[PDB]
């Protein structure tokens, strides 16, 4: 029984769901006598296909479009491999058994009426894995709850994010490029690589191996005239010498080793770097925002909060949040419209240059000996 108003809604129960009875299908590993075992997977293909459970009101296309518009777009991410791995060390004299399953992000679309839900369509999006381990001795009887799961559950913190369905700048006239920093992430976990739960004594890992070099830079201009993706890219190449925009071969990996008496939750997001292409003149006249992919960000929850209540919450307005250090690096740039005439001879004392209609222009020069001119 929800306390919202009537009509449809889009709900995201979050990441960290494990389906029922799909526990041991992937198999397990047995370690002994102080050895170390590492298992893992790469969410690339044949395992990144979402599972749809629709209702006549909500068909597959409806669910897909509605969730992708508001929450993370999984169709695009389904082609970029992401790898995860759990490592565990067995004791000196004992045996350990550890088995792996997949964790899914759960989305629901509902149709509230009179504070009562009368429909529910579910989408499960594969995100990452979860490894369950136990040290045993021969003949021990294991609780059935360790192997078998009768109903789905959220090992991570529960959530119910939802969204109802309807200073003085002393610069000179010219162009500039401002790098505003690194570690920009879109709101509503829209740029989330995934979440990993590491049990006591283990060590999780999330790796972006760049098996596919593609990337998804984001562009936003206040005026399509005089500005465009190509124009801003060329200006950045002139300013910061950026050679690759929609490509990259740099890998980022995050590793966390949980202590011996607690559990850890590591969240990995993709990050961005913000480049503002202003056109200050006398008072900003134009602005563009380029978000070049960075090498990710990692947050570490020491442990899930004690189960008290699933407090409903609404999605934040679309935007960005910066997690890296604050910076503002300003670089001037030559306006391509103006012409630049190069002087083939070095300039000595007492030189004259003949202006060679009313448009502005550029002249490039260098002196023959250091001094004041």
């Amino acid at each position: 029984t929800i306390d919202l108003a009537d009509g449809n809604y889009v709900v995201s129960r979050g990441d960290g769901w494990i389906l029922s009875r799909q526990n041991q299908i992937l198999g397990g590993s047995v370690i002994s006598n102080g050895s170390t075992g590492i298992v893992g997977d790469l969410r690339v293909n044949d395992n990144a296909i979402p599972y749809y459970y629709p209702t006549p009101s909500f068909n597959e296309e409806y669910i897909k479009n509605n969730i992708q518009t508001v929450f993370a777009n999984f169709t695009e991410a389904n082609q970029i491999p992401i790898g995860f791995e759990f490592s565990k060390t067995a004791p000196s004299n004992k045996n350990l058994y550890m088995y792996l399953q997949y964790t899914y992000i759960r989305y629901e679309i509902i149709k509230v009426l009179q504070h009562e839900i009368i429909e529910r369509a579910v989408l499960y999006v594969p995100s990452l894995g979860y490894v369950k381990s136990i040290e045993f001795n021969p003949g021990e009887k294991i609780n059935k709850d360790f192997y078998f799961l009768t109903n789905d559950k959220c090992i991570l913190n529960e959530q119910f994010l939802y969204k109802k369905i309807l200073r003085v700048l002393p610069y000179s006239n010219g162009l500039y490029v401002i790098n505003k920093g690194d570690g920009y992430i879109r709101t509503n976990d829209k740029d989330l690589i995934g979440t990993l739960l590491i049990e006591a004594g283990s060590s999780g890992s999330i790796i972006q191996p760049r098996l596919r070099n593609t990337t998804r830079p984001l562009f936003t201009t206040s005026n399509d005239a005089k500005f465009s993706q190509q124009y801003t890219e060329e200006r950045l190449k002139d300013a910061f010498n950026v050679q690759l925009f929609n490509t990259s071969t740099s890998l980022f990996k995050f590793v966390e080793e949980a202590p011996s008496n607690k559990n850890i939750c590591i969240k990995a997001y993709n990050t961005y770097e913000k480049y503002e292409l202003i056109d200050y003149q006398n008072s900003i006249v134009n602005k563009a925002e380029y978000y070049l992919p960075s090498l990710g960000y990692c947050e570490v929850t020491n442990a899930p909060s004690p189960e008290s209540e699933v407090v409903k919450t609404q999605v934040a307005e679309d935007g960005f949040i910066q997690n890296g250090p604050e910076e503002e690096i300003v670089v001037g740039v030559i306006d391509p419209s103006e012409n630049i005439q190069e002087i083939n001879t070095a300039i000595s004392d007492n030189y004259t240059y003949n202006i060679p209609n009313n448009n502005p222009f550029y002249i490039l020069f260098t002196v023959n000996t250091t001094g004041i001119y």
């Binding site: 293909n45 596919r212 070099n213």
Partner: protein, 49 residues
């Protein structure tokens, strides 16, 4: 009327699109325009054709 039976449209529609392509260095040779000249004969006769 049974040549295209084995084609399954739905599976094709379910294929992900190609994003990254590893190119073969030499995949184009050249283009050879074909030039032709048409002849013309004169067959004189007395019986109308």
């Amino acid at each position: 009327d049974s040549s295209l039976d084995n084609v399954n449209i739905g599976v094709i529609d379910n294929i992900p699109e190609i994003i990254d392509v590893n190119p073969y260095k030499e995949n184009c040779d050249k283009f050879s325009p074909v030039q032709k000249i048409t002849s013309t004969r004169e067959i004189n006769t007395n019986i109308p054709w």
